Amino acid sequence: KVFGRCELAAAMKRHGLDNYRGYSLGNWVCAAKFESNFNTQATNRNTDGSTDYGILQINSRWWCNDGRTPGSRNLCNIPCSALLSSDITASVNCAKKIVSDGNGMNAWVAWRNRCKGTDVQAWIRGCRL
Ligand SMILES: [Cl-]
Ligand SMILES: [Cl-]
Ligand SMILES: [Cl-]
Ligand SMILES: [Cl-]
């Protein structure tokens, strides 16, 4: 599923991501925009053989099991396929764990490079939320 901007904002809020660990909803929308272009089915292989999955491009090196990332962990206790669902529940639960791990949203390199410090409220501008 390819979400729209306000539709994704709405879904994130419903799943309690808005202001989670102090990160406003526009930060989460912005991260999703640049990690996956709002496509739940996004996958990208990393040079180290891990893969990033879903709307927030969660990495199999630590957070989910894909069966093909040797030496990896599965700290969200989920198959990485669950992260490609049209329903964002698994991605959201996992992102909560990720953003609580110590470095906040810096875990998401696109968020650090493209969202951090910017006018992130623009991402929820005009949305009925
Ligand atoms: Cl957009
Ligand atoms: Cl594995
Ligand atoms: Cl959803
Ligand atoms: Cl980047």
Q: What is the resolution of this structure in A?
A: 1.7
Ligand 3 centroid to residue 12 C-alpha, Å: 8
| Integer-rounded Cα radius of gyration of the chain | 14
Residue pointed to by tokens 């053989």? 49
66 labelled binding-site residue: no
- Solving technique for this entry? X-ray
Ligand nearest to the CA of 69: 2
Separation of CA 11 and ligand 4 centre (Å): 24
Q: What angle do CA 48, 95, 29 make, to 5 degrees?
A: 105
The CATH number of the domain covering residues in 1-129: 1.10.530.10
Q: Which two tokens stand for residue 76?
A: 């969200």
Q: Look up 35 and say whether it is catalytic.
A: yes
Structural tokens at position 46: 């990393």
Instruction: Please say if 119 is a catalytic residue.
Output: no
The type of residue at 115 is C
Q: Are 32 and 55 in contact (CB under 8 A)?
A: yes
- The ranges assigned to domains in the chain are 1-129
Distance CA 61, CA 9 (A): 27
Please report which helix (H) or strand (E) contains residue 53, including its range.
strand 51-53
Nearest-angstrom CA–CA distance, 17 and 11:
9
